[PDB]
Design a protein around this ligand. Structure first.
Ligand SMILES: CCCCCCCCCCCCCCCCCC(=O)OC[C@H](COP(=O)([O-])OCC(O)COP(=O)([O-])OC[C@@H](COC(=O)CCCCCCCCCCCCCCCCC)OC(=O)CCCCCCCCCCCCCCCCC)OC(=O)CCCCCCCCCCCCCCCCC
Ligand SMILES: CCCCCCCCCCCCCCCCCC(=O)OC[C@H](COP(=O)([O-])OCC(O)COP(=O)([O-])OC[C@@H](COC(=O)CCCCCCCCCCCCCCCCC)OC(=O)CCCCCCCCCCCCCCCCC)OC(=O)CCCCCCCCCCCCCCCCC
Ligand code: BCL
Ligand code: BCL
Ligand code: BCL
Ligand code: BCL
Ligand SMILES: CC[C@H]1c2cc3[nH]c4c(c3C)C(=O)[C@H](C(=O)OC)c4c3nc(cc4[nH]c(cc(n2)[C@@H]1C)c(C(C)=O)c4C)[C@@H](C)[C@@H]3CCC(=O)OC/C=C(/C)CCC[C@H](C)CCC[C@H](C)CCCC(C)C
Ligand SMILES: CC[C@H]1c2cc3[nH]c4c(c3C)C(=O)[C@H](C(=O)OC)c4c3nc(cc4[nH]c(cc(n2)[C@@H]1C)c(C(C)=O)c4C)[C@@H](C)[C@@H]3CCC(=O)OC/C=C(/C)CCC[C@H](C)CCC[C@H](C)CCCC(C)C
Ligand SMILES: COC(C)(C)C/C=C/C(C)=C/C=C/C(C)=C/C=C/C(C)=C/C=C\C=C(C)\C=C\C=C(C)\C=C\C=C(C)\C=C\CC(C)(C)OC
Ligand SMILES: [Fe+3]
Ligand SMILES: [Mg+2]
Lengths: 45, 47, 274, 318, 46, 46, 278, 46, 46, 45, 48, 46, 46, 46
């Protein structure tokens, strides 16, 4: 029942929210990795 | 769609963001005081 | 496939969340959003339980997901030292809560009251008492019972004997009385309905006047067709509620032997007689 | 904001109900029947009349003698002190014979009063079974209630009479007291190695927990469908209304399967009596064909094995 | 993002948001109490 | 891929996503709190 | 393993007695499941549910038992499942359209679902002859024809503390939106259970003062302010509540009509009731 | 294989698959956290 | 063997096959994890 | 019921998945046997 | 068809579904190659 | 104060009062019996 | 004695007898197993 | 003995016979497994 125009409009809002959420998550993970890497080596951390 | 005109939704989205901004602004200030008291990101040696 | 009268009831609406997205049936089951959540929680918990079985034993009775040590306190434990139990506990709580929320949607869709989800919430409250409320009050998740068919019986035994005689627990005495009374009420109610609708062969199906007459003939009182269902729900829910009370006061609110709790009765000035 | 069907709001009082007329061989009912507003909030407000027949009256006489014997022995145990009787009310009992007497008749004050009290109490419940049986037949009903009661009597007789006879001593039977019979319940589990490991004790708990579960479900379902007159279950069985349909559909949509309005009472009926039937069987098995239920559980591979946490104790006399 | 309020009731969104904040704030506060460093009322010394 | 919102209701998905993401984020933060090297409140040496 | 109760090197009496009960319990569960299938079976498998695109009857496991015969007091024998109740359900044309063509999709009502009988508004096919008691009197009847009944279980409570023993005759009826639909003019009582089943009310607030309509007691909140509040339906929707064929009698079919209509207001009374919280 | 979608509703399979993938991803990540060798946050050595 | 689908409904068999094989695939993988020689995560000597 | 064509269409759909599923399963078992055979000898593994 | 989808819509859904499955599997393959490079999960005859 | 009896049922007042007197007299008499000093039938010595 | 079959349904009697025979035959066989002398699978010596 | 099928419903009997013989066959095999002389899996000396 949902038309193409509103479906694209829903995707427009979703894309904006997704990229903002992704950006903070990527930045948070860069900071967390800079703080302490979570992939242990052969001998651990 | 729930009963709400563009004028009312736009009016709500202005008060909502300002309320969100004020709430976050106080929270950021509260975290500044909390960090100045005791930082919560330890170093390699710990605390 | 559907019951021959089911078609006119499978309508849209009544959901709490999810709406049209999850409002459909798979076979006889209504799904809803909470059905997806309760299925995810149920499969995840069961598969984690089966993994815990793989690491100890596959004997159905000997499978045991034990909580962490009391030394861990309220912290999340490593996976093989009680952390798996903690993950399954939150999955089980999620599964139980979404189950009752799913029943609320089904109740609303059928125009029924929310008595069934609320009555089930009493059971959820009792379970949450065992694994959340009592462990929280005592300060460690290790006070919860292990997830095992036979191992959690040993937990009940040892916890009951931590107070040297659990039969003397006043709330446990009341809860057992409700448990015994509700199955007595169920036997009476189940038998009475069957006796009326399945009388001696040849006789016609009897009426509600026979039901009142029978129990007034036997014990002098009849609670009625509406009263018995109120009484049955009351007895069952008090059995659930006082079960939670009896275990919540065992250790957070009483650390001594339960028989010693009755010393207040023995020292009442009315009947001291010494 | 909706009527929760918890208490009756509006009540109507007609004339007191004499009841369905009995065949012209039963005793007349009593002529005392009243209406209680408090009981009308929950259900039917009428109290009385009650039927007193041959078996009903004889059951009371045996029951009174049992209660008098138990009560007098309790009162004599506290030196006839009503104050000490109230103080020791939960602790007093009529003690069974000591083990030295076996199954023989013991002296009155050494278990004899217990055996007489047990005998008359057994007669009263047996006569009460016949009273319940006859009342159902007199009104032309089925005897389901009587046979549900007979299942309860089976556990009563298994615990107190059948199992002690199989063990060969009245001492193994249970005293007539509140806390003393809880002590018997615990000492039974201690003596025979954790009755939690008795499979029939497990099953009896399944149906005990399942009975409360079923009545919680059924009681809530009928109250939730009370908008559609669900509590009138006889009419819903002979003439399925929308309340029976919604009740059946509620559980079908929930857990995939459902009962009928009649069949849920069969489920509740059998769950209640299986709790008490399996319980009686499990009590008969212990001591007779199983000595230690935990060791039996180990033998059948059901006892869990725990890793080391402490230094195990070693029996000094081993 | 003003069109989000044409899809949801503002009252119900605020109830959900406020109830989430209440649970979040309590858990974080009680988590800090459980810590031997950020327990402010417990007199923890670093 | 706007076509995904024809199959699934968008606004119902948004509520489901927020509730689901809340559970996942809490789960991961709690996992890190249980670990020795990533409990930022306890601050064990790396 | 030696001692009394031993049957073999491993088997003992308590183990075999347990397996004897497992066999009995499995048989009992089969019997109980068959008793569960005396109403609503065999299942109607509609065309969209099968790859063969034809309606089918499904029995399930265990299959439904033989039909059960009930002897009724008036002199009738009814076979369960009833033929006419099934015949009515599989012949009526619902005024609803499934939201999606596949099986399991919910129905979207086309007309007014409250009066058409969809979902919570649905009614069962029941007999149109009003029930009678064992003595022979009319079972459900208003207080005007049943003069032996008085309102209030206790005279003293109804007299001195009337709040907890109310007499709702003469009260006002309020809809879910506060609309004053009418006024209670009578109470219908069940001679078998001695309970108020319905509250007869005029439609003076939304119709005529002479139009009578029945409000089920379980759909009515009888307050302490001489008001009766009906959260089920709007005050204006009282005008469409099904009317009695006879002004002094109500049949089991009529009871389903009335309780079905008010139950339809759980989802359809006002816009938004059928929608989720979020 | 495109005819599979003439038999199963796309939405119901998407819910089924996403639920299965969510459950499966959680189980494997949790199973790895149980094992010392693959407990990345645990940081065990080889 | 296409005559099978005149007897058994193909749509319900596929769902039955997928759910049934899911349980079996998990069950066998878990059986190997219980053993010493086939637990690939533990990596015991063969 | 279903026609010969619809039954054949279903079986063609079934044969595609059965071949791929059995092919992956066979390849998986060959790799598994090459890694650690699961049939022990008289002395064990 | 007992879903409502026409042949062309069934093909349209299949094309996106197969593409989404392949992209999901491709990311999974990359994840497993990185995972294997960190710590291989197939033990040798002597174990790890 | 005589207006009390127009407001209250004299019977339920008297039954209530007599019940209170019956219980109170019994409790007080029992309390004295429990005490060594005031147990008149015990015959203790001050 | 053939009049018995007009008093009782032949099917009902046969089921009652056959169930009685089955239960009795099981009981006697297990009674013999419990005894030391008549346990055939145990291979006891008399 | 074909009159047995006028008293007994053949269709019901065959299903009950298969289930009843399944129970009996499983029982007897399990009885032999619980013994030491006839447990073919354990292979005790005879
Ligand atoms: C002694 C104590 C210890 C023992 C205790 C007992 C053991 C443990 C407890 C277990 C008891 C219950 C176990 C079964 C649960 C019920 C499942 C079920 O449906 O059973 C129906 C079954 C009878 O089925 P029926 O109604 O005759 O079905 C007729 C046809 O099959 C009609 O066919 P159909 O049209 O219905 O076909 C449906 C088919 C078609 O499927 C599809 O086409 C799917 C299409 C997708 C696209 O498959 C499905 O749709 C269902 C699959 C599952 C769907 C799950 C969806 C999840 C959503 C959220 C729900 C969360 C839960 O009843 C039972 O077996 C359970 C009752 C017996 C046990 C009662 C409890 C005794 C306790 C004693 C103590
Ligand atoms: C030894 C240890 C136990 C000692 C117990 C002593 C005390 C016994 C009390 C327990 C009995 C409770 C049930 C009584 C009952 O159902 O009353 C209905 C019925 C009411 O009769 P009515 O009012 O004249 O009939 C009205 C119409 O016929 C209309 O009546 P209706 O249509 O309501 O009745 C029809 C009903 C008829 O119900 C009965 O006839 C009752 C069933 C008799 C056996 C009771 C079973 C429980 C006993 C223990 C079970 C575990 C044994 C395991 C042993 C090792 C552990 O249909 C049934 O058959 C329901 C039961 C289905 C059982 C399915 C079992 C299949 C086995 C498959 C095995 C496969 C391997 O009572 C009787 O028929 C009395 C018969 C004797 C009862 C037992 C004494
Ligand atoms: C002012 C405007 C609104 C708002 C307007 C919107 C709009 C419009 C959108 C979002 C969307 C999102 N918003 Mg928002 N959002 C707001 C501000 C925020 C803030 C913040 C603190 O400021 C955060 C963190 C978020 C976060 C989010 C995400 C939930 C989502 C983006 C990711 C996504 O695509 O999900 C997709 C990911 C999934 C669906 C994965 C689902 C995970 C499943 C459910 C896992 C469940 C299993 C579970 C973990 C099992 C537990 C077992 C355990 C053992 C217990 N929003 C405010 C409140 N937001 C988007 C969205 O949700 O689209 C769907 C979107 O379109
Ligand atoms: C030494 C042992 C002590 C003793 C120690 C204890 C301890 C310890 C406890 C009890 C508890 C109880 N004891 Mg005690 N108790 C003793 C002797 C007895 C005797 C007796 C005859 O002697 C009786 C009748 C009882 C009876 C009772 C009940 C009052 C209570 C159990 C019911 C309950 O908890 O409901 C509550 C019901 C639940 C918690 C069930 C929860 C339901 C959940 C929400 C749903 C689960 C769904 C499931 C996962 C679905 C499965 C999947 C599907 C099947 C497919 N005890 C002896 C003396 N007893 C328990 C209690 O009261 O705590 C609450 C308890 O912890
Ligand atoms: C430490 C204690 C032991 C224990 C020791 C025992 C012993 C011993 C027994 C049980 C029994 C039972 N146990 Mg246990 N039990 C334990 C822990 C539990 C727990 C728990 C959560 O921990 C639960 C839920 C239970 C529950 C149960 C029930 C399933 C079962 C009782 C059924 C019943 O309703 O009898 C109550 C109903 C009756 C006894 C029948 C009543 C009918 C008669 C006719 C009533 C007549 C009334 C009379 C006329 C009134 C007037 C008399 C005069 C005034 C005197 N036990 C632990 C392991 N348990 C009983 C059983 O069946 O064992 C398998 C039993 O004998
Ligand atoms: C491309 C679109 C769909 C898809 C389209 C199709 C189509 C079309 C078909 C399949 C079929 C199958 N698909 Mg597929 N399938 C997909 C991708 C997959 C993937 C994957 C990871 O990519 C896998 C592993 C599978 C797996 C499967 C199998 C279940 C099945 C092929 C084997 C078979 O014929 O079973 C046959 C075996 C049985 C029927 C036996 C049934 C087993 C019963 C349930 C007994 C098991 C008991 C169990 C062991 C109990 C556990 C123990 C407990 C303790 C009690 N599919 C995608 C998602 N798939 C075929 C199929 O299902 O045919 C039946 C088929 O026609
Ligand atoms: C409070 C009064 C009584 C009561 C009421 C009650 N129970 C109820 C209801 C009500 C009103 C329902 O509506 C609901 C229902 O739908 O019943 C059919 C239910 C129910 N009560 C149930 C069980 C149950 N009730 C119990 C007790 C009681 N229920 C009380 C006595 C018990 C006991 C005493 O042990 C059990 C086992 C279920 C049949 C059902 C709710 C089922 C449910 O929520 O299922 C969700 C899906 C799952 C598969 C669950 C998965 C959970 C986890 C992910 C895994 C397992 C974790 C668990 C901790 C394992 C524990 C194992 C060991 C303890 C052996
Ligand atoms: C399915 C098993 C469950 C069950 C079922 C069950 N019980 C039953 C029944 C059933 C089906 C009955 O029909 C029967 C009954 O009457 O129920 C209302 C009964 C019953 N279950 C009872 C009790 C009971 N049931 C219990 C348990 C259970 N009952 C199980 C949980 C227990 C427990 C948990 O221990 C108890 C204590 C009784 C209330 C009743 C059986 C009544 C009976 O046997 O009566 C005779 C016995 C006597 C001791 C006689 C007493 C006489 C009075 C003391 C006379 C008083 C004096 C005077 C006459 C009064 C007037 C005074 C004057 C001054 C005017
Ligand atoms: C002084 O008091 C007065 C007189 C004022 C009245 C007061 C009475 C009071 C206070 C009574 C109090 C009673 C109480 C508290 C009773 C408590 C009872 C309890 C809790 C009982 C619980 C369990 C008891 C059981 C299960 C007993 C079972 C005994 C049985 C089944 C005995 C059977 C005995 C038989 C069948 C005897 C057979 C005799 C033969 C002839 C066979 O022996 C040779
Ligand atoms: Fe009922
Ligand atoms: Mg004692």
């Amino acid at each position: 029942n949902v038309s193409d125009e509103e479906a694209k409009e829903f995707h427009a809002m979703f894309s904006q929210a997704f990229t903002v959420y992704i950006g903070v998550a990527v930045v948070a993970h860069i900071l967390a990795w800079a703080w302490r890497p979570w992939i242990p080596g052969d001998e651990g951390f | 769609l729930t009963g709400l005109s563009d004028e009312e939704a736009k009016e709500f989205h202005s008060i909502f963001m300002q309320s969100f901004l004020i709430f976050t602004a106080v929270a950021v200030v509260a975290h500044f005081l909390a960090w100045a008291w005791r930082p919560w990101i330890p170093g390699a040696e710990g605390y | 496939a559907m019951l021959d009268f089911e078609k006119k009831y499978r309508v849209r609406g009544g959901t709490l969340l999810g709406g049209d997205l999850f409002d459909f049936w798979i076979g006889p089951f209504y799904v809803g959003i909470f059905g997806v959540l309760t299925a995810i929680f149920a499969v995840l918990g069961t598969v984690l339980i089966i993994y815990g079985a793989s690491q100890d034993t596959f004997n159905l009775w000997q499978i045991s997901i034990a909580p962490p040590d009391l030394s861990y306190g309220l912290a999340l434990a490593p996976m093989m030292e009680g952390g798996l139990w903690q993950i399954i506990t939150v999955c089980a709580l999620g599964a139980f809560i979404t189950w009752a929320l799913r029943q609320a949607e089904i109740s609303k869709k059928l125009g029924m009251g929310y008595h069934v989800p609320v009555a089930f919430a009493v059971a959820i409250l009792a379970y949450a008492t065992l694994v959340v409320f009592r462990p929280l009050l005592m300060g460690a998740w290790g006070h919860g019972f292990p997830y095992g068919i036979l191992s959690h019986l040993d937990w009940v035994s040892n916890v009951g004997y931590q107070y040297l005689h659990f039969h003397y627990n006043p709330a446990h005495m009341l809860a057992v009385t409700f448990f015994f009374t509700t199955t007595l009420a169920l036997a009476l109610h189940g038998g009475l309905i069957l006796s009326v609708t399945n009388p001696k062969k040849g006789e016609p199906v009897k009426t509600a006047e026979h039901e009142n007459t029978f129990f007034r003939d036997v014990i002098g009182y009849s609670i009625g067709s509406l009263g018995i269902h109120r009484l049955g729900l009351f007895l069952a829910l008090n059995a659930g509620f006082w079960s939670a009370v009896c275990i919540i006061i065992s250790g957070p609110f009483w650390t001594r032997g339960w028989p010693e709790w009755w010393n207040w009765w023995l020292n009442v000035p009315i009947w001291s007689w010494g | 904001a909706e009527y929760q069907n918890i208490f009756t709001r509006v009540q109507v009082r007609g004339p007191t109900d004499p009841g369905v007329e009995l065949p012209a061989a039963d005793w007349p009912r009593t002529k005392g029947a009243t209406h209680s507003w408090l009981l009308g909030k929950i259900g039917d407000a009428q109290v009385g009349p009650i039927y007193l027949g041959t078996t009903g009256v004889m059951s009371i006489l045996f029951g009174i003698v049992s209660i008098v014997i138990i009560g007098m022995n309790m009162l004599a145990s506290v030196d006839w002190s009503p104050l000490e009787f109230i103080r020791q009310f939960f602790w007093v009992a009529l003690e069974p014979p000591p083990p030295e007497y076996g199954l023989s008749l013991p002296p009155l004050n050494d278990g004899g009063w217990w055996l007489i009290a047990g005998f008359t109490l057994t007669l009263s419940v047996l006569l009460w079974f016949a009273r319940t049986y006859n009342r159902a037949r007199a009104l032309g009903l089925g005897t389901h209630v009587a046979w549900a009661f007979a299942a309860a009597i089976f556990l009563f007789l298994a615990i107190g009479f059948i199992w002690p006879v199989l063990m060969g001593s009245w001492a193994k039977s249970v005293p007539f007291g509140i806390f003393p019979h809880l002590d018997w319940t615990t000492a039974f589990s201690l003596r025979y190695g954790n009755l939690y490991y008795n499979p029939f004790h497990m099953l009896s708990i399944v149906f005990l927990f399942g009975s409360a579960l079923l009545f919680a479900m059924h009681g809530a379902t009928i109250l939730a469908a009370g908008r559609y007159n669900a509590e009138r279950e006889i009419e819903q069985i002979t003439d399925r209304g929308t309340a029976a349909e919604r009740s059946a559909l509620f559980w079908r949509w929930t857990m995939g399967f459902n009962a009928t309005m009649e069949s849920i009472h069969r489920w509740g009926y059998w769950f209640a009596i299986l709790c008490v039937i399996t319980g009686g069987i499990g009590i008969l098995l212990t001591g007779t064909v199983v000595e230690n239920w935990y060791l039996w559980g180990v033998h059948h591979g059901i006892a869990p094995e725990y890793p080391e946490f402490f230094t195990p104790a070693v029996d000094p006399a081993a | 993002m003003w069109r989000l309020w044409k899809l949801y009731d503002p009252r119900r969104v605020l109830i959900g948001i406020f109830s989430w904040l209440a649970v979040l704030a309590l858990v974080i506060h009680f988590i800090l109490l459980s810590t031997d460093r950020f327990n402010w009322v417990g007199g923890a010394a670093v | 891929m706007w076509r995904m919102w024809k199959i699934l209701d968008y606004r119902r998905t948004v509520v489901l996503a927020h509730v689901g993401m809340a559970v996942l984020a809490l789960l991961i933060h709690f996992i890190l709190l249980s670990t020795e090297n990533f409990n930022w409140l306890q601050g064990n040496p790396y | 393993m030696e001692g009394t109760g031993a049957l073999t090197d491993y088997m003992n009496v308590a183990q075999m007695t347990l397996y004897a009960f497992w066999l009995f319990l499995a048989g009992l569960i089969v019997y109980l499941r068959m008793e569960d299938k005396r109403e609503g079976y065999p299942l109607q498998a509609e065309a969209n549910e099968n790859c063969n695109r034809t309606p089918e009857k499904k029995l399930g496991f265990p299959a439904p038992p033989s039909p059960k015969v009930f002897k009724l007091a008036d002199g009738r024998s009814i076979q369960v499942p009833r033929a006419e109740k099934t015949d009515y359900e599989l012949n009526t044309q619902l005024r609803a359209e499934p939201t999606a063509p596949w099986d399991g999709a919910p129905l979207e009502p086309t007309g007014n679902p409250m009066v058409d009988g969809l979902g919570p508004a649905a009614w069962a096919k029941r007999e149109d002859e009003p029930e009678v008691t064992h003595g022979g009197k009319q079972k459900i009847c208003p207080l005007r024809v049943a003069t032996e009944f008085e309102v209030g279980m206790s005279r003293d409570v109804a007299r001195f503390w009337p709040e907890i023993d109310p007499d709702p005759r003469g009260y006002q009826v309020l809809g879910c939106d506060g609309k004053v639909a009418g006024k209670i003019v009578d109470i219908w009582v069940d001679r078998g259970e001695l309970r108020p089943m319905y509250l007869e009310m005029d439609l003076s607030g939304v119709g005529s003062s002479g139009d009578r309509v029945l409000l089920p007691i379980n759909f009515a909140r009888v307050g302490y302010d001489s008001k009766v509040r009906v959260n089920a339906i709007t005050g204006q929707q009282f005008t469409d509540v099904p009317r009695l064929r006879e002004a002094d009698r109500i049949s089991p079919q009529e009871e389903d009509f009335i309780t079905g209509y008010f139950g339809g207001g759980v989802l359809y009374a006002v816009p938004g009731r059928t929608e989720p919280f979020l």
